[PDB]
Amino acid sequence: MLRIAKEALTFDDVLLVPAHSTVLPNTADLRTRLTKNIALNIPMVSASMDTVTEARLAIALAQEGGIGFIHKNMSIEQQAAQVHQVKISGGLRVGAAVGAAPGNEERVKALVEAGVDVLLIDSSHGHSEGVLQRIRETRAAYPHLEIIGGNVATAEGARALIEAGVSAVKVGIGPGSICTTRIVTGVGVPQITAIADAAGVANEYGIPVIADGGIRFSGDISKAIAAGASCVMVGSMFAGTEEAPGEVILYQGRSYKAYRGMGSLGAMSLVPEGIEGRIAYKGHLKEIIHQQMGGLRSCMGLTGSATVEDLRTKAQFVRISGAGMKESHVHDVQITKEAPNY
Amino acid sequence: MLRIAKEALTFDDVLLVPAHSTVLPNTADLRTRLTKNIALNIPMVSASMDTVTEARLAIALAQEGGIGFIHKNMSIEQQAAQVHQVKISGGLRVGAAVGAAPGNEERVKALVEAGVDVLLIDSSHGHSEGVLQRIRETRAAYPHLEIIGGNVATAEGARALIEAGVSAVKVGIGPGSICTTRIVTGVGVPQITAIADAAGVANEYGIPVIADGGIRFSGDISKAIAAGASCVMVGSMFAGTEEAPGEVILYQGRSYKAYRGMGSLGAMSLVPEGIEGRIAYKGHLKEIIHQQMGGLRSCMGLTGSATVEDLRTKAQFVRISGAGMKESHVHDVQITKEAPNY
Amino acid sequence: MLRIAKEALTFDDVLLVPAHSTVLPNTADLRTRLTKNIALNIPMVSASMDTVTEARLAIALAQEGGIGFIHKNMSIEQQAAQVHQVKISGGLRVGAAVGAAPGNEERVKALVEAGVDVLLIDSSHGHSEGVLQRIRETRAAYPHLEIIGGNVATAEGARALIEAGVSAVKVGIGPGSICTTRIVTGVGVPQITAIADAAGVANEYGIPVIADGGIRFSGDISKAIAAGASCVMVGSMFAGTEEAPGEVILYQGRSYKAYRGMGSLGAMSLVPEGIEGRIAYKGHLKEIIHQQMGGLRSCMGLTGSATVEDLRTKAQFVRISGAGMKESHVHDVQITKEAPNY
Amino acid sequence: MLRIAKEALTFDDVLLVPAHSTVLPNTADLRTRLTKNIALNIPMVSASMDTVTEARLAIALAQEGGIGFIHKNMSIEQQAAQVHQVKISGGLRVGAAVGAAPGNEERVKALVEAGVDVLLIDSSHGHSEGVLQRIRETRAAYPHLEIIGGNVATAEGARALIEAGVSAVKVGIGPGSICTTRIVTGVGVPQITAIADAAGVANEYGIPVIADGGIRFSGDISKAIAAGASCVMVGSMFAGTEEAPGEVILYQGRSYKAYRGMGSLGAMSLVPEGIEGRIAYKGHLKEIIHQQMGGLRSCMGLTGSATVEDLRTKAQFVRISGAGMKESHVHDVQITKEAPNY
Ligand SMILES: NC(=O)c1ccc[n+]([C@@H]2O[C@H](COP(=O)([O-])OP(=O)(O)OC[C@H]3O[C@@H](n4cnc5c(N)ncnc54)[C@H](O)[C@@H]3O)[C@@H](O)[C@H]2O)c1
Ligand SMILES: NC(=O)c1ccc[n+]([C@@H]2O[C@H](COP(=O)([O-])OP(=O)(O)OC[C@H]3O[C@@H](n4cnc5c(N)ncnc54)[C@H](O)[C@@H]3O)[C@@H](O)[C@H]2O)c1
Ligand SMILES: NC(=O)c1ccc[n+]([C@@H]2O[C@H](COP(=O)([O-])OP(=O)(O)OC[C@H]3O[C@@H](n4cnc5c(N)ncnc54)[C@H](O)[C@@H]3O)[C@@H](O)[C@H]2O)c1
Ligand SMILES: NC(=O)c1ccc[n+]([C@@H]2O[C@H](COP(=O)([O-])OP(=O)(O)OC[C@H]3O[C@@H](n4cnc5c(N)ncnc54)[C@H](O)[C@@H]3O)[C@@H](O)[C@H]2O)c1
Ligand SMILES: O=c1[nH]c(=O)c2[nH+]cn([C@@H]3O[C@H](COP(=O)(O)O)[C@@H](O)[C@H]3O)c2[nH]1
Ligand SMILES: O=c1[nH]c(=O)c2[nH+]cn([C@@H]3O[C@H](COP(=O)(O)O)[C@@H](O)[C@H]3O)c2[nH]1
Ligand SMILES: O=c1[nH]c(=O)c2[nH+]cn([C@@H]3O[C@H](COP(=O)(O)O)[C@@H](O)[C@H]3O)c2[nH]1
Ligand SMILES: O=c1[nH]c(=O)c2[nH+]cn([C@@H]3O[C@H](COP(=O)(O)O)[C@@H](O)[C@H]3O)c2[nH]1
Ligand SMILES: [K+]
Ligand SMILES: [K+]
Ligand SMILES: [K+]
Ligand SMILES: [K+]
């Protein structure tokens, strides 16, 4: 009577199993794919959010081997200009977002004319007739444009996007840090299972999966890749960097920047699907990426994964309980110094 | 040796799976049934509680497409008068509660004479000889009166109520926010399983199930409907509105109203089965309903549920762990603004 | 490789399922057995602890239909005198504790001479050669003395005690509120499973099981009985009453009494297996018993259990998750008044 | 699609089952093995950490029947001198650590010349070509030197170490109190399962398993042994003792010592895998060992384990839920005095 499809898992439900290794962290190969036609030197892309990615962060991230997605909460002229600013900064790639609603044809044309490398239809509605037909329309108009459609969280959603013509499948319905879709609507799929379910289909086509949302610690990047993702999209992890939009706010001896959902009231201007918040100031993006990729390298040394494909297709998990996750964190000790990756 | 019937689930144990959709939130159809003979434009009814539903809230709720149940903690004359006040307010429907104990015949007669649309026998003892024979007596005296009996939490309880002649089955033993039945007695069934178990029987008869208690967020409304309920009954979600009984209380810069169980000592005047509390002031009921139904509409857009029946009979769940629920909430960020639906 | 016998449950893992009922709380029959030869009017006995049971509480409890166990942390003459004081208070029954170590023969003789109704060998070592041979020695010396041996937590422990000649089996290794055996030693069995496992054996002999430790709320009493216990032993629930030993301590506007484990350093005067604490002052034992038995009566009304035997042998459980237990408690509301049973 | 090998358990997921006993705590035999050739009078060894083990603690621990591992964060001359200082203190055994990287030949030679009893290659990379070939090189150079290699967390890791020539297998990837490997990398195995998996292989060879990390309470020592370990390695439990390195720090009326991971930035001088912290001051190591071994003795009395081998090979577990662990701790009472083992 209760129509329950299966028990789905998230990052804190699993750990990666150490295995025979010939890999040292400094020899690990971090290269991967965003699409069949767009390679990345590291498996990180930035969220299309108004508190994460404008040209400044997109440039810095691309210089580190990732790609940024310029957010849609600005005029067409402004967004095209940001794309152009990244493109003229010496051989760098950039993406840009547009919404799922009809009437974005002019915006897409302007972004393409500005040299955008990949268009994102930025939505939770990947498995909808509207988004699928938007993808088909876009693929007709731009036969050689790399396209990522709305997010999905299932095998059938991934298949539908692929059949519509996307270049990569992005996975995540409500796992975001600043996000309340799952609470407001009741809808979502724990992210590890969501990634694996999508990958089971996408792998058949050689189409990359992008794991979007819920990444808190560098270890979550490893887990997302092992679940089947070719790369991760992050908001919180990059929010609060110097390069992210917004000024640094001093409060009670500590520094912060604003970070908000794109379905928050502030971002939309209504029934919101995110909140408005503040996040500790992180310093420069370069050091954050170094910390995060250091964790992933150390993972690859422990799992014996020479490349991201090895991690993505060969590494094994164990299922854990809540006590297992409490043991994984610091426990039974007072932390006197905050570590740069914790 | 341990007589354990099965593992039962509640709202936070499950999420709804996104599916193919042709539904936009503004095209979703929220109409449903309270009984075979009483339709609702939205799937919400208010609790028969002395801190939730008197005529003022019953009127406002009926104007929004729901129905209120006037509580029993007042004299017969007062309760009939409240019913009458809702009935003369332009085409509005109303319910009213009576207790399970013998001797309520005069009260029932007065409520019927005042034009009550549906009588509720307001109790946790739906599966008891007393309540079942009270239903039979009432159905004999008023062959055309819509009747809802005591609450149940099982398939057999639902069957018994149906065989006694009820017009809808209401489900919930102790899930309420302000309620302690399960702690004081040890008795209850997690609400998602309770709803599904009742619905498995009630569906055979075309008899609506009402999911009563434990609804905290709009996403819980979606889940209750998908578990099999035609509509939800809420106390906490409407307590604290301007229209609910009681005055607004200012304390340390914030406003509150009283909210208490009907088995609390205060409400009964003894071994209580609820507590007395205060709840943040919510403003006008209209905006709360708009927020809550906005969440449900957004659910229906994501699940592809065109109607409440589609959600109730076709949408699928996934089982989740505690980590999955922590990911669903806001996490790893400081909330600087409270959202109207969170 | 990991020798794991099975997954064991405690009170918060389960709820009782409501069933057809002809029972009202005021008609429920609370009578039960402590042993085949000692009946109780209510299913409650007090812990043999120096912060719970001396003559004053033993008298008050016996007047309410239970039995107290006078603790062993006093001289032989003092303990015999306390027994005598309960016996001369008009037809009342009393128990008394002795430790498991050799050399307690004189103490046992003095307690028997004072008229003790039941002797408890007060220990966690029920399944030990020493305790079993102590029981055999005692049964030889006093062929008609009701005897309860050391605690057990397994079927085989219960069988061994029965074969040694006990009159009741007491179950509980480390579930106590003030107790640390499970943390210090790593040994124990979650109490619901422990009770059921013991009862599976004891039921074959018609020998009562006493559920000792871990009872926090009245609903836990219901659950212990449904798991197979004929009655419960409580420390925390009665500590802090006016009748318990110790003076009332005022601190920051609230009143307390001391409550400590019998393996705490304070009680022993070493490697302790309990702690020293304070518990809120509860008032008179009579009102506490009324609240606790009111909860049990309300359970019996909901489960349709006319007698304690019906609850003990017929009522069904459902297994629940942590979300199910959070729903059972008060949730999402501020408690402005503390209820007498919560 | 999700490559999940099995559900793995940690200390708080399990309890030991009481069994028939002829063992009293004072008759329990605590003797065990560190290697086939090195016996221990108690099953405790100290972590090779710069805030746990230098000569002073190594001497005190060896006098109590354990063995200390002098940490590697000092010059060769200094480390050899510390070894020598323990060796000349009247018949005492000592170990010493070296890192996994090439170029430690001189350090090993100096430690051997100073009389070290056992060499530890102190690493998380036990299952790596580098560590395995380091073990082989060392075994070639010192055919009669007791060697422990890098840590492992799997059956295959244990087999590989054994085939390379180790004298004991040490188990633990990231369970440490002050440690963040699992969070930073995503890699690890809950410690109870890790120990059992290693032991399943090591038992075939008669090779001891050492359970390293995650031990918080004395009951965890019992559980590690029952999972298959011959002895435990502890950092937190001994940090903060008078004999551990570092001065006592007074802060707000309480005393502390520093305790930090060996992958913390402070210890390494970078992407750290531990943190820097402070731990409450514990007093002299002798009393801590007495408390911890008192807990283990009490376990052995309850499980009927006459020897450590009996506990290690015969004692049974039950799986528990989070409610079972909450019952095991102190609950529902205010602790007015801190117990020496809690
Ligand atoms: N990945 C997620 O779980 C998630 C969820 C909500 C919001 N968001 C973020 O917020 C922004 C808005 O995302 P969104 O579009 O999912 O939020 P949304 O559900 O508010 O939809 C936004 C617009 O798209 C159209 N739309 C609404 N429901 C639709 C449906 N069921 N099918 C097709 N089209 C529909 C409407 O025109 C609407 O104004 C984006 O920047 C996105 O990244 C993400
Ligand atoms: N849905 C729930 O889980 C729940 C539980 C307790 C109270 N309540 C609320 O509190 C109020 C009282 O509800 P209640 O009647 O369940 O509380 P209750 O158990 O206190 O019963 C109230 C009255 O009904 C009769 N009654 C008591 N036990 C009975 C039984 N086992 N069978 C038949 N009749 C019995 C008695 O005359 C009693 O005074 C109502 O407004 C109700 O909504 C709800
Ligand atoms: N039910 C429990 O889980 C539990 C646990 C510890 C203490 N206690 C309470 O504390 C008091 C002491 O109880 P306890 O005796 O279990 O604590 P314990 O384990 O400290 O034993 C106390 C005495 O009994 C003897 N003893 C010790 N270990 C034994 C063994 N393995 N087999 C046989 N005899 C042994 C010794 O002489 C010892 O001094 C009692 O009042 C009891 O209620 C209860
Ligand atoms: N048991 C654990 O889970 C754990 C984890 C991290 C650190 N530590 C502690 O911190 C210290 C450093 O331990 P570590 O060496 O595991 O930390 P690590 O991963 O930082 O490695 C330290 C050095 O060993 C070499 N190394 C790095 N990765 C390697 C790999 N994949 N295979 C082979 N060699 C590699 C490098 O030269 C590196 O500088 C030790 O004292 C150790 O006890 C323990
Ligand atoms: O449910 C949502 N409501 C929102 O308001 C919202 N805004 C962003 N997003 C999504 O969250 C991702 C960022 O997540 P993290 O901060 O966890 O990296 C992003 O990359 C998006 O997928 C939203 N999701
Ligand atoms: O166990 C109970 N003790 C009480 O004192 C009590 N009062 C109300 N109710 C029930 O709780 C429902 C309201 O629940 P929410 O606040 O969660 O919406 C209501 O609609 C009722 O079903 C009670 N349940
Ligand atoms: O592990 C233990 N260490 C102790 O120091 C201790 N003292 C009492 N007891 C046992 O706890 C029971 C009382 O438990 P409650 O307070 O939960 O009712 C009692 O009835 C005893 O079974 C102890 N258990
Ligand atoms: O992940 C790690 N990062 C670190 O920085 C670190 N330093 C020590 N160790 C390991 O932790 C063990 C001590 O653990 P406890 O404090 O829990 O006894 C030790 O015995 C080591 O196995 C580390 N692990
Ligand atoms: K850890
Ligand atoms: K979220
Ligand atoms: K509740
Ligand atoms: K306990």
JSON list of C-alpha atoms in Angstrom, two decimals, chain B residues 124-129 131-132 150-152 154-158 160-161, chain C residues 18-22 301-302:
[
{"chain": "B", "resi": 124, "resn": "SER", "atom": "CA", "xyz": [-8.42, 8.45, 19.82]},
{"chain": "B", "resi": 125, "resn": "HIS", "atom": "CA", "xyz": [-10.78, 5.53, 20.33]},
{"chain": "B", "resi": 126, "resn": "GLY", "atom": "CA", "xyz": [-12.04, 4.84, 16.87]},
{"chain": "B", "resi": 127, "resn": "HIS", "atom": "CA", "xyz": [-11.48, 1.09, 17.24]},
{"chain": "B", "resi": 128, "resn": "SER", "atom": "CA", "xyz": [-13.59, 0.65, 20.35]},
{"chain": "B", "resi": 129, "resn": "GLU", "atom": "CA", "xyz": [-16.98, -0.83, 20.91]},
{"chain": "B", "resi": 131, "resn": "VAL", "atom": "CA", "xyz": [-17.25, 4.67, 19.52]},
{"chain": "B", "resi": 132, "resn": "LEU", "atom": "CA", "xyz": [-18.49, 2.16, 16.96]},
{"chain": "B", "resi": 150, "resn": "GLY", "atom": "CA", "xyz": [-12.78, 8.41, 16.32]},
{"chain": "B", "resi": 151, "resn": "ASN", "atom": "CA", "xyz": [-9.29, 8.23, 14.98]},
{"chain": "B", "resi": 152, "resn": "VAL", "atom": "CA", "xyz": [-7.66, 4.98, 13.96]},
{"chain": "B", "resi": 154, "resn": "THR", "atom": "CA", "xyz": [-4.69, 0.49, 11.35]},
{"chain": "B", "resi": 155, "resn": "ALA", "atom": "CA", "xyz": [-6.40, -1.31, 8.50]},
{"chain": "B", "resi": 156, "resn": "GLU", "atom": "CA", "xyz": [-8.80, -3.05, 10.88]},
{"chain": "B", "resi": 157, "resn": "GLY", "atom": "CA", "xyz": [-9.69, 0.16, 12.61]},
{"chain": "B", "resi": 158, "resn": "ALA", "atom": "CA", "xyz": [-10.55, 1.73, 9.25]},
{"chain": "B", "resi": 160, "resn": "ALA", "atom": "CA", "xyz": [-14.54, -1.19, 11.51]},
{"chain": "B", "resi": 161, "resn": "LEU", "atom": "CA", "xyz": [-15.37, 2.46, 11.15]},
{"chain": "C", "resi": 18, "resn": "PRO", "atom": "CA", "xyz": [-4.06, 0.12, 18.99]},
{"chain": "C", "resi": 19, "resn": "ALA", "atom": "CA", "xyz": [-6.61, -2.67, 18.67]},
{"chain": "C", "resi": 20, "resn": "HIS", "atom": "CA", "xyz": [-10.27, -3.41, 19.11]},
{"chain": "C", "resi": 21, "resn": "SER", "atom": "CA", "xyz": [-11.26, -2.40, 22.56]},
{"chain": "C", "resi": 22, "resn": "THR", "atom": "CA", "xyz": [-14.07, -2.93, 25.04]},
{"chain": "C", "resi": 301, "resn": "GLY", "atom": "CA", "xyz": [-8.00, 1.16, 26.80]},
{"chain": "C", "resi": 302, "resn": "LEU", "atom": "CA", "xyz": [-6.29, 1.68, 23.44]}
]
